Design a protein around this ligand. Structure first.
Ligand SMILES: CCCCCCCC/C=C\CCCCCCCC(=O)O[C@@H](COC(=O)CCCCCCCCCCCCCCC)COP(=O)([O-])OCC[N+](C)(C)C
Ligand SMILES: CCCCCCCC/C=C\CCCCCCCC(=O)O[C@@H](COC(=O)CCCCCCCCCCCCCCC)COP(=O)([O-])OCC[N+](C)(C)C
Ligand SMILES: CCCCCCCC/C=C\CCCCCCCC(=O)O[C@@H](COC(=O)CCCCCCCCCCCCCCC)COP(=O)([O-])OCC[N+](C)(C)C
Ligand SMILES: CCCCCCCC/C=C\CCCCCCCC(=O)O[C@@H](COC(=O)CCCCCCCCCCCCCCC)COP(=O)([O-])OCC[N+](C)(C)C
Ligand SMILES: CCCCCCCC/C=C\CCCCCCCC(=O)O[C@@H](COC(=O)CCCCCCCCCCCCCCC)COP(=O)([O-])OCC[N+](C)(C)C
Ligand SMILES: CCCCCCCC/C=C\CCCCCCCC(=O)O[C@@H](COC(=O)CCCCCCCCCCCCCCC)COP(=O)([O-])OCC[N+](C)(C)C
Ligand SMILES: CC(C)CCC[C@@H](C)[C@H]1CC[C@@H]2[C@H]3CC=C4C[C@H](OC(=O)CCC(=O)O)CC[C@]4(C)[C@@H]3CC[C@@]21C
Ligand SMILES: CC(C)CCC[C@@H](C)[C@H]1CC[C@@H]2[C@H]3CC=C4C[C@H](OC(=O)CCC(=O)O)CC[C@]4(C)[C@@H]3CC[C@@]21C
Ligand SMILES: CC(C)CCC[C@@H](C)[C@H]1CC[C@@H]2[C@H]3CC=C4C[C@H](OC(=O)CCC(=O)O)CC[C@]4(C)[C@@H]3CC[C@@]21C
Ligand SMILES: CC(C)CCC[C@@H](C)[C@H]1CC[C@@H]2[C@H]3CC=C4C[C@H](OC(=O)CCC(=O)O)CC[C@]4(C)[C@@H]3CC[C@@]21C
Ligand SMILES: CC(C)CCC[C@@H](C)[C@H]1CC[C@@H]2[C@H]3CC=C4C[C@H](OC(=O)CCC(=O)O)CC[C@]4(C)[C@@H]3CC[C@@]21C
Ligand SMILES: [Ca+2]
Ligand SMILES: [Ca+2]
Lengths: 594, 594
């Protein structure tokens, strides 16, 4: 399909080199083969192939200085060449010898008036996961990424705009953050900003956003580039006083903190898929800012929401304890029919003043449900449950207003959805927070992978056991009446949570006692203690990084509280300017000791 | 509040520097800006701000030699300056340039008759956890802590008392033990004691106590400073003979052992909150002294107390086995009323001579209870239980003397409080001692953190299950009658200590079998084996450091036995002086091999 075609275009490129001898001698520099063909007939000086390549392209792509130079006097009208077939579209040979770091050949290109503007918008230059280089779309963006100091100075002299944006809006400082060698990215970064000693009006190149709106300070935090992040912090510092080993220092907090309706750096670190971005979250202004927001305004508001939710769940719980039951009207259709009670009706529900006090609690309940949805629906996993909990009150609101069957099951959902959301509020404690991360990674990581192997062993053995108690007396190790019940027995004999079956009274069915021994060795010993050994590794894995998993829970919570509460209750953190003479910016003081 | 105000006072300091140009040019040395203002109008030569700072202070705090010297001829009447607003109170600039290690500027201060006496009693110099330096309150105490060898010699020449005590009584040798760099603390320590070649009367500076009474030998043991501790031991040694690889050595034991009613070093290491202090407990005189006290007098007395307590608990146990029961008077109020017996009365209790022998045992019991309280109340966790055990005998003493209901429950406390105090006496064995440390750290470390998450899952599911068996026949998986009993069922289905419920006889309630499968995956597999993986780490953690946890149990026990037993049964450990000609001190011989 796609990658098949891309490999075909590589060898069909290899074919048309071997077709034309001018294209062939461009690869291996046979100057004899070159200057024979040039002193001959015209012989297709700009004939293209599948990709749009030329002989000057191939001599550059296979590192031929001499074969290219002889071709230059032969045809100087070429050099402005857009290699263009949908995947290489825009690329020049002046792109090529820069990526190959060929300083002699790009000198001859800039001698013949090369184009340091050319936008390589071909799909092998997009920022995609299927293209394992992203160097930009410009020669100066190419020269920067490959650590090519000489050429970088050379290109700008010939008119290479340091400010030019590619088809994602990224400047060359945005592209240097995306490079995998984080240390060599730093040195080429300063060389481009040094040359921006001109042009300080309109965001002097280290404030210019892309189409996403991010600056190179905020993009280093989103991409997790901590080395570039600690570099750019030094511009946003201010040493204040150095009394011995003490040191006071102000941090800038204009792009780190919530400037306005813009997405702050703490919002973008939480709302990203990249895992390395959460190592920004303990750097020297950020860790102090989160601790200041949590200890002074985040933890008091979170504990008061945790207490109001705890009373509301009791005010839910006590109403569904006292739910309208009555003795039944009809009688037993079977001896197995074994209810002794029945749901009451709304007409005869609220008769006493005792029940008048009850419906207060249920009106506290239902009003709480529409408050939840009006908060949440106009927008992690506890978001899903609290929407499901509000849904389950408004289900059994509807079912009682038309007085129908099965109130219990929408409530049977509701309690465990309701009370396990108190475990949400366990993140407000250092020593209880990452316990819920353990619970998740065991379910979605260890249960949901091994569960398929457990259920295969169930349906194997539970069918195997149900043909042994089908032709028997169903009260006498009646652990198997039904393929439903046999899936309920073997689920609870795998786990050893009910008794391993035996009756020891009657002449027992034979093949069973062979079979349950086969079962109990492989289920209750081998595959149950597989899972216990699995989840023991998950516990060890999450308890190891337990501090940094809790800190990411606090940043997620503090951002969530700050956006939704009104500004008159969440004061802006830090010390304001304009009275201490620093600017209108909002700073933060940190004092340390070395 | 507090730290908010402290940061405001740092930037308001930064404001009033930027207000007055004399204060501004004190920071960055603009001598031009200085000598313009000085050849002008008087212009407030000693105007203060919020903190009481001066221009000579700011030039010293921001390291200006030249700006300070020009200011000295301008106003030589300053230098005696008490910077004084409640938090900086007492501090001189002569304090400041010493902490900044500015040897040229303090030369010009001592040229202009500086004050090496000044007591920086401001709250930013107290020994508090919120001030992360404690260098003392004096310039010589400052110069010592910052490792400033040159200035330390210089100050004493200008009359810096090495013996001066700050507002906690600590001398400079006390303050050098509190410094975090333990190796550089040692070298500056000797330089101050070398200069105490004068003044040997009245405790020659290495015996002088603070207001707590501690010497620098005993303070190094309380603070856990093992490097300073092994240093000061060398003064308290005596090599005795060196026969080949053998070596005999006497240790001093005047401050290590219990000199009298004073608090010995072994008492202060146990009664401290610092954790590093228990690494003193295996140094070369201390480890031999504890082993000598334990093997010769501690372990015999502890095993005899462990045997007398074991007989007393049997003498408690057998009486509350034979407790006054009789057949009941009334009859069954319900079929569920199912006692077949009743408490007897004190009148008809002691009728036979068999019961006369019983009350002997109970008088052994009660006398044992008031002995415990008369021992203990006029003063760790086994202290709390043995006071609670003595309380529970004297509860059921009172209840029988007025012949009332419920003897059993104060006794039901009493047994498990009584017999688990035998586990106290497991510290008298090397291989049984730190088992009780495991039991504590699992309860207060692993249970009491995760218990909140277990109970949340209980009330979630046990409410969820109790609405499924409310409208049923309560004898048929009657594991749920009551929200009390449902909290008792789900506590014992979480733990899988009772059978996972099933009846398999009647048409079963439907939503239950969905729900218990939801429950048994998350309770009996996921969250129960969370705790087993948690407490397995606690076991590994305590069994790793199991020798040094047992040795701290012995020091705690030996000190406790020695204080309470009379002196005529606990002889003073070691070899006395005054007959072997060493002094009146009590020494200890150790023989080793290298
Ligand atoms: C921790 C404290 C636990 C205390 C547990 C108390 C347990 C036991 C007492 C029929 O039965 C007789 C009537 O009793 C009821 O039925 C009460 C039904 C609803 C109770 C919920 C509070 C009522 C008012 C809602 C008030 C607003 C509460 C929520 C606002 C945030
Ligand atoms: C990890 C997730 C695992 C999910 C599955 C775990 C189980 C959850 C499944 C279902 C959840 C609950 C729904 C009930 C469905 C069963 C219907 C039933 O029992 O009816 C009948 C049986 O009929 C059957 O046996 C149907 C089952 C076919 C074999 C299993 C395939 C389904 C899953 C496999 C997919 C492979 C996935 C695994 C590998 C990829 C009942 O018969 P009876 O009334 O007793 O008749 C008496 C006979 N007499 C009349 C002669 C006297
Ligand atoms: C994980 C592995 C664990 C083992 C699990 C087994 C794995 C496979 C093992 C063995 C596979 C072979 C199974 C043959 C079964 C047919 C025999 C028969 O019909 O029984 C007859 C009984 O008479 C007997 O009991 C004779 C003995 C048969 C089994 C011999 C020991 C097998 C295990 C040796 C050691 C194992 C070596 C393990 C390797 C270390 C008939 O029974 P009945 O009572 O007369 O009446 C029946 C009436 N009914 C039909 C209505 C009910
Ligand atoms: C290891 C040894 C275990 C031996 C266990 C013996 C077990 C079995 C014998 C009515 O029943 C008939 C009367 O018997 C009793 O009721 C005795 C009740 C009190 C017993 C306590 C010792 C009595 C004197 C206390 C003596 C002072 C003892 C404490 C002083 C330190
Ligand atoms: C780690 C420590 C955990 C502590 C809690 C663990 C549990 C220990 C708690 C208590 C210990 C024992 C005391 C008994 C109290 C219950 C009273 C009761 O059952 O009465 C009644 C119910 O009423 C209730 O349901 C009250 C419980 C409200 C919800 C739970 C809140 C309390 C704990 C949560 C605090 C959050 C802390 C967790 C997160 C921060 C009994 O009802 P009935 O008689 O069957 O009536 C039949 C109805 N009929 C009349 C229609 C027929
Ligand atoms: C940790 C997770 C473990 C799973 C736990 C479950 C989690 C959530 C799962 C599912 C949520 C949805 C629940 C819907 C229940 C309502 C249906 C109903 O009313 O039943 C009817 C029965 O008729 C049936 O049995 C129809 C089948 C319903 C369930 C289908 C399989 C669900 C699990 C698929 C596989 C799971 C996939 C798991 C992912 C790998 C009514 O019953 P009745 O007998 O006719 O009479 C009732 C009388 N009574 C009211 C007095 C009692
Ligand atoms: C009816 C009376 C008693 C008024 C009180 C009702 C409260 C019980 C509810 C109403 C809506 C509120 C909620 C509003 C929305 C939020 C979402 C929040 O969602 C998450 O769990 C974040 C998910 C994640 O990050 O993993 C948790 C509950 C919270 C703070 C609130 C919890 C409690 C509140 C105050
Ligand atoms: C009543 C019957 C029909 C089923 C009810 C069981 C499940 C639907 C619920 C109830 C309790 C569980 C929850 C309990 C707690 C966890 C932690 C987890 O929290 C996190 O996301 C960790 C990261 C963070 O907190 O930020 C999210 C939900 C999860 C897996 C669970 C999701 C689903 C579970 C199995
Ligand atoms: C009535 C007749 C049988 C006389 C014998 C009574 C003994 C059973 C009791 C009386 C009070 C004594 C106690 C006195 C006080 C101490 C406190 C000691 O406290 C602790 O557990 C230390 C706590 C800790 O360091 O963690 C334990 C028991 C002990 C030695 C004694 C145990 C046994 C004694 C001899
Ligand atoms: C009868 C019912 C109502 C409750 C009785 C149970 C608890 C009150 C007691 C009985 C046994 C336990 C104790 C058993 C032994 C441990 C070891 C622990 O010993 C230590 O302090 C270790 C350090 C040292 O020994 O010096 C202190 C008490 C502890 C946790 C326990 C404290 C409380 C427990 C749970
Ligand atoms: C073995 C564990 C740790 C997890 C492995 C896979 C589970 C995801 C599967 C295995 C088979 C189970 C099923 C087994 C049979 C039941 C019957 C249930 O409804 C009924 O038919 C019985 C209701 C009644 O008896 O009235 C629906 C699905 C359920 C809980 C199960 C759903 C999920 C389970 C736990
Ligand atoms: Ca059982
Ligand atoms: Ca069992």
């Amino acid at each position: 399909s796609w990658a098949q075609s891309r490999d075909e275009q590589n060898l069909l490129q290899q074919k048309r080199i071997w077709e034309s001898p001018l294209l062939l001698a461009a690869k291996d520099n046979d100057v004899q083969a070159l200057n024979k063909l040039l002193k001959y007939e015209d012989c297709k000086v700009h004939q293209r192939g599948a990709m749009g390549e030329t002989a000057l392209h191939i001599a550059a792509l296979y590192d031929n200085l001499e074969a290219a130079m002889v071709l230059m006097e032969a045809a100087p009208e070429l050099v402005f060449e857009p290699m263009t077939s949908e995947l290489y579209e825009g690329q020049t040979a002046l792109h090529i010898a820069v990526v190959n770091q060929n300083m002699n050949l790009v000198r001859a290109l800039l001698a013949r008036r090369a184009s340091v503007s050319a936008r390589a918008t071909g799909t092998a230059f997009r920022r995609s996961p299927c293209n394992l280089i992203y160097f930009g779309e410009h020669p100066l963006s190419f020269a920067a990424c490959v650590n090519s100091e000489e050429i970088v100075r050379l290109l700008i002299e010939h008119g290479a705009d340091i400010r030019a944006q590619d088809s994602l809006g990224n400047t060359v400082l945005h592209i240097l953050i995306l490079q995998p060698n984080k240390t060599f990215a730093c040195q080429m970064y300063n060389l481009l900003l040094s040359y921006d000693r001109h042009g300080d009006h309109l965001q002097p190149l280290d404030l210019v956003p892309n189409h996403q709106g991010l600056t190179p300070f905020k993009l280093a935090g989103v991409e997790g580039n901590t080395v570039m992040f600690q570099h750019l912090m030094q511009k946003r510092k201010h040493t204040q006083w150095t009394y011995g080993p003490l040191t006071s220092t102000l941090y800038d907090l204009t792009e780190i903190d919530s400037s306005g309706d813009e997405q702050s750096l703490l919002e973008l670190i939480i709302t990203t898929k990249k895992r390395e971005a959460r190592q920004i979250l303990d750097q020297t202004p950020v860790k102090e800012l989160v601790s200041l927001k949590w200890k002074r305004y985040g933890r008091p508001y979170f504990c008061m929401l945790g207490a109001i939710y705890l009373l509301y769940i009791i005010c839910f719980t006590m109403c569904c304890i006292y739910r309208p039951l009555k003795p039944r009207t009809n009688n037993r259709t079977s001896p197995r029919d074994n209810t002794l009670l029945q749901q009451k009706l709304l007409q005869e529900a609220y008769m006493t003043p005792k029940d008048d006090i009850r419906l207060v609690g249920e009106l506290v309940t239902v009003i709480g449900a529409i408050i939840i949805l009006l908060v949440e629906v106009p927008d992690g996993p506890f978001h899903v449950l609290i929407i499901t909990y509000a849904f389950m009150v408004l289900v059994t609101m509807v079912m009682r207003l038309i007085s129908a069957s099965g109130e219990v099951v929408p409530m049977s959902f509701a309690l465990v959805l309701g009370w396990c959301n108190v475990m949400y509020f366990a993140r407000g404690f250092q020593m209880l927070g990452p316990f819920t991360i353990m619970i998740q990674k065991m379910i979605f990581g260890d249960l949901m992978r091994f569960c398929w192997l457990m259920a295969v062993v169930i349906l194997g053995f539970a069918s195997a056991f149900y043909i042994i108690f089908q032709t028997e007396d169903p009260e006498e190790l009646g652990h198997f009446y039904d393929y439903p019940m046999a899936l309920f027995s073997t689920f609870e004999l795998f786990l050893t949570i009910i008794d391993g079956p035996a009756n020891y009274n009657v002449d027992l069915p034979f093949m069973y006692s062979i079979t349950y021994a086969a079962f109990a060795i492989i289920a209750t010993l081998l595959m149950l203690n597989l899972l216990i050994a699995m989840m023991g590794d998950t516990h060890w894995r999450v308890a190891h990084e337990r501090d940094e998993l809790w800190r990411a829970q606090i940043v997620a919570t503090t951002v969530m509280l700050e956006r939704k509460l009104p500004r008159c209750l969440w004061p802006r953190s830090g010390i304001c300017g304009r009275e201490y003479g620093l600017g209108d910016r909002w700073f933060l003081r940190v004092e340390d000791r070395q």
